[PDB]
Amino acid sequence: ESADLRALAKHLYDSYIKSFPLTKAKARAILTGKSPFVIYDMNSLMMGEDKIKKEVAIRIFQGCQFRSVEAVQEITEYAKSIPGFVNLDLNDQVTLLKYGVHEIIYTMLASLMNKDGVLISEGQGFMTREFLKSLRKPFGDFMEPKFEFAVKFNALELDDSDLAIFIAVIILSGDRPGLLNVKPIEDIQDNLLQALELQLKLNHPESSQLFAKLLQKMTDLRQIVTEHVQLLQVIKKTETDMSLHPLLQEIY
Amino acid sequence: NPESADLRALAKHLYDSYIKSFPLTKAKARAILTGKTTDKSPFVIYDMNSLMMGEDKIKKEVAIRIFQGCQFRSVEAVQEITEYAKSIPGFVNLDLNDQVTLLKYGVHEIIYTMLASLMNKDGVLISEGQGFMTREFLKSLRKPFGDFMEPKFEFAVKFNALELDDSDLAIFIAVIILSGDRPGLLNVKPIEDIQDNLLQALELQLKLNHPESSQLFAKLLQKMTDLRQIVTEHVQLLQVIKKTETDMSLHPLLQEIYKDLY
Ligand SMILES: COC(=O)[C@]1(Cc2ccc(O)c(CC=C(C)C)c2)OC(=O)C(O)=C1c1ccc(O)cc1
Ligand SMILES: COC(=O)[C@]1(Cc2ccc(O)c(CC=C(C)C)c2)OC(=O)C(O)=C1c1ccc(O)cc1
């Protein structure tokens, strides 16, 4: 019966590796020392465009949104590999992904961050924390709360096999508004929570109450998400130069 | 068999995303139209009085109010197709300008493909299938509004005879969006590679779902010629409206789609 939880752990690890090119293992190997191009100022950014692929702060934010949409499809694919997920009411699958992707993006973004900056373009670049802080308000305070979260999150020293199960727990949240059949969602999350618990005991025997400490980080995650939504409004309200091509507006 | 297993998974994925993106499926449309039902029975608009009463029953000039109404729903349909497109594996990975190009030229061919699901020889479901507007009433509309819908009906009765279900249409409308032959595409090869995979997916789906339908795949692909022609006539008809009805307002998103279209 513990054998089924190990099978679930391995299953989610295998699907996580398939769905996400840039693992934490890979990201960590880079961040510590195929060296990446560093963006530390406007001049290094300008030259960066030759491998990054009107105003600086707006172009960066927009680029980030384009790449965020690419990640949502990777997470959607991963979600369909979670035992029981596709058997749920189709409206509930949509609800769980709509509310879940933001929490997952910031969880996985921590894998790409240290206190000094963040890997960009599947590890091709490194944009410095200071450069992002240096953008004219309100763009200068967008990434900073994410860095704060990442520093505290990365102190848990989770690996990819741990994060694979954790991400599944996030997706199967029974408290998303508008859910029609909460029972099988909580029943799957119960099984994932059991699998995560055993994973963290076996993988981190020396790490006392790591399970508890990880679940507590959900608080921080949700604050980071609501804070981003609120700052997305300040943009929509007061930004004249944000108006993209009407058909691009639709995709985002 | 392992290769064909990945094509079944792609068809599954696309159908699943089709159900999520499109509130009114062919399956629901046909259940309303084939008049089996007591709860799903539509109110029928066939004349002015039934249109007037339809205003209370369903939730300026007549021909204009109907045309302004189709405009707004077309916009809402562009939204649904755009949401579907994002779900097609590889689409959001493509160049940003090419994503815009594929949608610009693709959405109207998809609108008319899926409008067929809502049509029989006698008329078309309106207001999410609550209403039904007769083909005769639409044809009797003041020139040039009288012949906007008739070419869609002509296409629909022929297309509908292929007897495709939603699981077929999900892969077909994906094949339409990933068209490498669109004017102004910067990188064609990555589009063609996605369409290759979609076409394999469609071919196995039509073979498994329609075993006794000879060359249904080839016959479906030929219908893409008919869609192309319906869009041209539609655009020509809009040019006439702009000049004849200067007081009538086209939607910017639709204007942007129509801007320098062939
Ligand atoms: C989970 O990770 C991600 O989704 C991202 C998306 C992404 C990919 C390539 C990129 O060049 C960017 C641009 C990142 C910035 C900070 C302008 C984002 O992949 C990243 O390497 C990265 O830094 C991401 C990212 C996502 C959301 C953000 O708010 C910031 C970065
Ligand atoms: C989903 O239903 C359709 O496809 C349309 C849109 C439609 C929806 C509700 C409506 O009330 C109407 C007609 C408008 C009034 C004010 C009675 C049209 O219903 C139609 O009869 C019709 O012709 C629709 C249509 C046609 C062409 C398009 O490009 C888009 C929608």
Numbering used by the authors:
A (entry chain B): 207 to 239, 244 to 263, 275 to 473
B (entry chain A): 205 to 263, 275 to 477
What does the paper say about this structure?
The nuclear receptor PPARγ is a pivotal transcription factor regulating mammalian adipogenesis and adipocyte functions. The protein kinase CDK5 can phosphorylate the serine (Ser) 245 residue of PPARγ. The phosphorylated PPARγ at Ser245 is associated with the down-regulation of insulin-sensitizing adiponectin production. Butyrolactone I functions as a PPARγ partial agonist.
To elucidate the binding mode of butyrolactone I to PPARγ, the crystal structure of PPARγ LBD in complex with butyrolactone I was determined at 2.1 Å resolution. The crystal structure of butyrolactone I-bound PPARγ LBD adopted the canonical nuclear receptor fold consisting of three layers of 13 α-helices and 4 stranded β-sheet. Butyrolactone I was bound to the canonical ligand-binding pocket (LBP) via three hydrogen bonds and hydrophobic effects. The oxygen atom of the benzyl group and the oxygen atom of the lactone group in butyrolactone I formed hydrogen bonds with Oγ atom of Ser342 (hydrogen bond distance 3.3 Å) and with the backbone oxygen atoms of Leu340 (hydrogen bond distance 3.0 Å), respectively. The oxygen atom of hydroxylphenyl group in butyrolactone I participated in a water-mediated hydrogen bond with Oη atom of Tyr327 (hydrogen bond distances 2.6 Å and 2.5 Å). The hydrophobic effects of butyrolactone I were presented mostly with H3, H5, and β-sheet of PPARγ LBD, including Ile281, Cys285, Arg288, Ser289, Ala292, Ile326, Leu330, Leu333, Ile341, and Met364. In particular, the 3-methyl-2-butenyl group of butyrolactone I was surrounded by hydrophobic residues, including Ile281, Met348, Leu353, and Met364, which formed a hydrophobic pocket. On the contrary, butyrolactone I did not directly interact with the Oη atom of Tyr473 on H12 that is known for the major interactive motif of the PPARγ full agonist in PPARγ LBD. While the thiazolidinedione moiety of rosiglitazone formed a hydrogen bond with the Oη atom of Tyr473 at a distance of 2.8 Å, butyrolactone I did not interact with Tyr473 since the distance between the oxygen atom of hydroxylphenyl group in butyrolactone I and the Oη atom of Tyr473 was 7.6 Å. Consistent with previous studies, Ser245 phosphorylation inhibition by butyrolactone I could be attributed to the binding of butyrolactone I to the hydrophobic pocket and interacting with several residues on the β-sheet, including Ser342.
